[PDB]
Amino acid sequence: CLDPDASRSVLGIILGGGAGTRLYPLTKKRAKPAVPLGANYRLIDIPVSNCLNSNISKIYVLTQFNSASLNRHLSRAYASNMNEGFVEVLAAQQSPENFQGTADAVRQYLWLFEEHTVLEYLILAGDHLYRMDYEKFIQAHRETDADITVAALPMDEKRATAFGLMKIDEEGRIIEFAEKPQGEQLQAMKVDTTILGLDDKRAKEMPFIASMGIYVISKDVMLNLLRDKFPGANDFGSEVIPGATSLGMRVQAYLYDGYWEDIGTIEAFYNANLGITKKPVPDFSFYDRSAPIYTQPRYLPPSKMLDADVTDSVIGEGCVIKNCKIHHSVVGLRSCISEGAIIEDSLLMGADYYETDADRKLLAAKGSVPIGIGKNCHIKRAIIDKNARIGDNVKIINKDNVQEAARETDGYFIKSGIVTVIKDALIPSGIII
Amino acid sequence: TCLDPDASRSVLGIILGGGAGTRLYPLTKKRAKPAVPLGANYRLIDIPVSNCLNSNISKIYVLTQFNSASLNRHLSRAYAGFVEVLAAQQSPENPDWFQGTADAVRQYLWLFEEHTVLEYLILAGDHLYRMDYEKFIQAHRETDADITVAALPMDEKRATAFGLMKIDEEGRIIEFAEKPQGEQLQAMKVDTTILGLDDKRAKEMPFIASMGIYVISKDVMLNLLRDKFPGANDFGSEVIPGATSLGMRVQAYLYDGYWEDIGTIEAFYNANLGITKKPVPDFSFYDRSAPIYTQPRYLPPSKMLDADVTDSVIGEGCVIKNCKIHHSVVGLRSCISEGAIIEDSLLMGADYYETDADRKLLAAKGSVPIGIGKNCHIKRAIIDKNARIGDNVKIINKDNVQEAARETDGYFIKSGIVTVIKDALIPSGIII
Amino acid sequence: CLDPDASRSVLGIILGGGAGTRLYPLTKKRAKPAVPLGANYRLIDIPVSNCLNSNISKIYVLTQFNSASLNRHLSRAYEGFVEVLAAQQSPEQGTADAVRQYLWLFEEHTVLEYLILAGDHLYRMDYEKFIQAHRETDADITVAALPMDEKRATAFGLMKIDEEGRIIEFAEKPQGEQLQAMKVDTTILGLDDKRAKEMPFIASMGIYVISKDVMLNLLRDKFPGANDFGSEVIPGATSLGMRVQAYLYDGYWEDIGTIEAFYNANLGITKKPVPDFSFYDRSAPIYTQPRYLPPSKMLDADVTDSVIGEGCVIKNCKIHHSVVGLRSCISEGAIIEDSLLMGADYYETDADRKLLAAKGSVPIGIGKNCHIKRAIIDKNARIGDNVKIINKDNVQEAARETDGYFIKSGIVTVIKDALIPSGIII
Amino acid sequence: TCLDPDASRSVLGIILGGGAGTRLYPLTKKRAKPAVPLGANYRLIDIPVSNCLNSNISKIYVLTQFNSASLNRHLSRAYASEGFVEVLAAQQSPENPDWFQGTADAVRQYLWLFEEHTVLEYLILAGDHLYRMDYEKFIQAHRETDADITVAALPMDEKRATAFGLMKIDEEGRIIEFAEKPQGEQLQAMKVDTTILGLDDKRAKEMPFIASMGIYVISKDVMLNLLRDKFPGANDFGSEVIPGATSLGMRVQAYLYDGYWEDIGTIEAFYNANLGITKKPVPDFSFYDRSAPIYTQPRYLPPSKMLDADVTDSVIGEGCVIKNCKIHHSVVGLRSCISEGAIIEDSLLMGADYYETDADRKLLAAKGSVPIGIGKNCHIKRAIIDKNARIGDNVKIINKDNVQEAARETDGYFIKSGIVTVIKDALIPSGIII
């Protein structure tokens, strides 16, 4: 428990719109927080939900640019029902026509954040797949009298490079910090993860304590660090966190034990998404009796299946599936899948609306193709973004096993060997990718 | 066009949710009729409450002879203007005593009287349909009617099952006939062109039926119930015709579109399976502008391990293993086990998920878990909420028994349809 | 520190309505929880607000009969929910009977305990500490206890605790060797010797925290015929050896069940320096319906010791030691002293106005050159010009319904919507 | 008759909340114009948003050159909890921008965002005018006449006319010419027959001119064409772009506006309009209305307390605490605290954002500081006291020398039109005579 309660003492600040290319092309026609997730959600639903389910109701979403789409989702899913909570988007730019780092994004709105009578700021990333009760995270921050509390966990040697690593004393206080080190520096960070609880067998298998990129910073400390101490810092992990320690500030670590995946990259995203189909039980479920992941109420009808053979898959709401075959895939909301289509190890983002039988009549008369997966199509190891018009006989098998290829003009982009059809893209029948 | 004052401030919707629920038994066993599960993700009550909401009518009262915890939670969480239950009896038990619709409305007239409105929109809570009540209420105001009756056109074969009306050339209602036949059916012939129906269909459907939908001016309601007919029990069959008899202004208003009375098991069974109809369903719950609402449950997308789904609809948060599902409707949270074969059935689903912990206790005693057991076979059946059906169960009804009651056993049979009572436990190997 | 959370594990059940014959005629044409209070509130706001500020978001309000007005108030003002539960199907009993009736509904909620709030009382309390004490003592029923001296003590249902605070005996208005036998050591419940000695008696308040299974078992199996909670079920569960603990309540607590006590409590917000009870509070404000009423206007008012509610229209007049309710219109020359003006449910336009005058009627509000002293003016009262309500004869009681008023404890109370013709004197 | 599609899904509201607020300083010192306090219990932004909401317009953007914490909190609590009400700032800092930005530039910069909405027309509203209006009929007219732009028109006499941009129409209500603040001959060449709009003949003769009001309806496409293609360089919306459109033969129609309307964008006008709700007969403008009231944040403040107050021609906000004083022809904002012997005349008291506790007052008294509110024996005359001001005892804000203009920020006040304005949070020590 906490006192004062988190509701009135903790402010949530989500770092969403990274303004990068890591998830390109999923971020080509939309704000990063809006990227579709798990058949029925969007990235931003993960941190907003965890907050709400943690009794945190004052939330700000820091993103690159305003998006009518994003606001509409946030407004309809959260704004409606928070005695004074809120979920507000704070855009960095006045347009999508332009860079900026996390510490820069926070300093920009320091004048607004400091107006809140709160004891701490909860800083979350907007692209991690995980369930966490932030009250225990904050509880640890208050009991250790920490200036900054960094969430951490065991990390293997392969990924250790992509993270900020640390070393803690028996109290969990952070004694040594290093942002994405490598070489001698990376090996020098290897530590005994037995103090974390790891038996011994899997402790030498993960001799690293990696930062999860989320933090609890006491109000005045934040203002102090960003305005006075490091007015020139751009990133938290790379500059603010290391700087705070070097100054001798109380930097505490908090050990997380649940599931946790950063899905900021295409491959990671892809694997995480198909990860909800694994049996007997997936490492992460959006639904939880106690702490479920929320999303926008859509009142879509129950999915229709004409003649479908579905194995190891999850099906979103309001799908219209004909005589087809779906395997080890995630079928997004409002997905239309035609006759003879074959979907394998894929992620179908679905669609934003339904075309009418009349809409589909005009398209044909013009040689265009309807939203959805066309007849006798083969979709394999792909990410089909929203409203994609995939013509008949299209096959996305990437025969040659090409790893990368930027083909925006042809409607796709290949990354890590994954073919991602862009949003609203049309892919003519007969095309083979 | 537009209503002025608007329906939001000048109209009061009053839904006749149901009596003892004698007609949809056992879907109503200890469950108020408005709470009965529908189309995988909804409840009956969602139909009239949605139509009101999409019609800019926000003040809604739901009258029901007995109350129900699920009805209150549903209305509470899904809506509430306001949406409130006005129960005749505050108990979840099925009343063994009779109360007619006129009685139901009479008892709470004093409450509806407290609302400053122009009309009361009276809706039956047993039909499947979509309707924008705005034009309906506008017509009522333009014709200066005291009562406006939604009229459904039909042919000679379907008409003997409704209360018909006879209109003059101005669409004014001048006579009623409750389920007429022979010479009285004929004397009810009407020229349907007068209400807007075209020639071919007018001659094909020369009878107009009331469909439990009415608009009644405030004062008229009070007068009819307290003064004119204080002993009337039935609103539609006694009070409306009574009003016409008094020379009151009762107008017809043509209703055009899909409409099904689903207050009886068989009709309920059919309509529910009608959403799987090919090429397209007669009634869709979803609609771009006027969708049917319900409670946001934040249920996860349905999981299917190895399912063969033919002409069916899958609700939300389902957990389907390897099985065959043909021409069926699968309600929310459903759990189908390995080897199950489901055909021509309506699965209500469940109200919650049994944790692995609960499944342990269950395993400890060898008890049956909620869901469809392994290798079961469900045919032409309705499976109410949280049913605990065991392995190798076979519900196929071989002797084609038509009517039958076996509450004790946990089921009923009406028109060949087997209905597994809610929370019912059907032991392993049982063959029905 | 509650775990699980109160909002998730506690169901609030407020017991109002119930006959309502002491506050007549304020309860004549309305539901009891809806009776106006302190210029801008209603009775029901006190318990609902204390619940909400105590993290208790699931609330049922039990009343005698439905009321669109009360619902409107609760709807517009307040996962969570605040639902009214009517006992009867028309406006034409025991506390446990009231609760029992909806057992079928209460039972369906997955809560550890039910918070029972009964009676009409002014007071701010944090039910979280009360629910904590109940949990820490692994009690079946925790009964809020009010400390008291021997003078008052002999007038209430006293309780006797033990070294552990566990209540072991009850007694309705005891005296002699029996009153002295109830006398306990309040220091045990948390009071300091000083106060504990001044008040060696503890009384029930009508506030209880009952565990879910317990109240279901107590009301359904154990005492299915019990009518009242405190007089039967609570004592009865103790004699059956159930852990019935007591929680010391040490704060403002004023009864407002009678016209005289209701009157004094409302005028009490004008108490010097700091009134005993303030409706506002930085942490636990008393909530109410947002009406978007305009700032109050005063053309020429001499106001002393009084509070003025929202959107009032006041011409030239004197207001003294009074509480002026929302939307209250006061005409020229009016003199108002020691009265509670409850205001109006709406405003009249000059259209409806210059249509009443020309119809021999009276517009809502206090008329020209009126005088109102020691009176309670219910909602929408139409008081004509020159009316004088002084009760010069100091009459104590008078049922003058037909004339739009009633006199109680020397206090004149003008019925809601009543029309007092101009010139009338009282 | 009503709009189809309804305003909610087809109309987008865009409020020009203000620029750097130089004309309303110091009420705009570190406070975007939209957040400026009004009528004891409201803020400027409440007028247009309420007019929108009461017109079935629920998608709303508020443009303001700079941002402010209070503006964000107010909209969040009063409206956030259907469409939205979002602030689109030009600079994400609460500091008053020292650079210029025109209204046309304001909108042009976010046209990409507006364009993302599926609406038919854009309703453009000034954010510093006091008036009540149902935008539905107005929008209805825009659609029936197939107009490209509809401008609400305000009839006025020769005297008042010179301060506004006047318009000339034909005999069918179409606008054919504009004159920005005309005089002499230019003014005379603008006279029109207001009857053409529906005005009364008698009134039409006393008011032969019609001014633009800063209220327009523009078809989505027309908007993009004008600011992107036709006039990519225009800075001012109502003075360059609209006349431009008319110049291009676009269908620019006038829509008569009857009723109360005051521009409260300068100190003097703002001041007069606020004190205008204290008229004995009938206030020309009422924040409250049976059908379309001005909304604001529900604050759950307690009834105002008055110890010994002689109040004449004044309005009193919510949660006030008043002792033995005299309040004449004034507006007293929420949470106001007025001490013993204070005389408040012809003044607008904005109130405070919170209450101080006795604990707080002892600490202030102990350190020789001043508590929020007006002090004992204070004389406040013809003044605007902004939020949380700390006026010490015996302070006299009377302006003995009748100074008309004076800037004295370091002293905590500005004088404009003989109106003293005490700056927000300003501390005016006891005995001080202004």
Ligand SMILES: Nc1ncnc2c1ncn2[C@@H]1O[C@H](COP(=O)(O)OP(=O)(O)O[C@H]2O[C@H](CO)[C@@H](O)[C@H](O)[C@H]2O)[C@@H](O)[C@H]1O
């Ligand atoms: N200008 C901007 N405005 C708003 N949002 C922006 C932004 N720039 C980036 N973001 C978002 O905020 C998060 C911040 O992460 P960083 O960009 O600083 O780097 P990194 O992803 O390497 O991770 C970090 O996360 C890992 C764990 O994933 C730690 O180990 C490491 O110490 C830490 O730097 C990203 O997930 C991104 O989506």
Ligand SMILES: Nc1ncnc2c1ncn2[C@@H]1O[C@H](COP(=O)(O)OP(=O)(O)O)[C@@H](O)[C@H]1O
């Ligand atoms: N006591 C009752 N309270 C509320 N609704 C009822 C009651 N009895 C029946 N109903 C509902 O009202 C409808 C029956 O309408 P009614 O006008 O009484 O028919 P009839 O034509 O037989 O008079 C059905 O939708 C039914 O579920």
Ligand SMILES: Nc1ncnc2c1ncn2[C@@H]1O[C@H](COP(=O)(O)OP(=O)(O)O)[C@@H](O)[C@H]1O
């Ligand atoms: N940069 C700006 N952004 C938003 N609104 C502005 C800006 N500058 C001024 N405004 C507001 O818009 C309206 C019009 O400004 P004004 O300077 O008279 O130009 P015009 O009327 O020619 O458009 C006023 O209500 C003003 O406060």
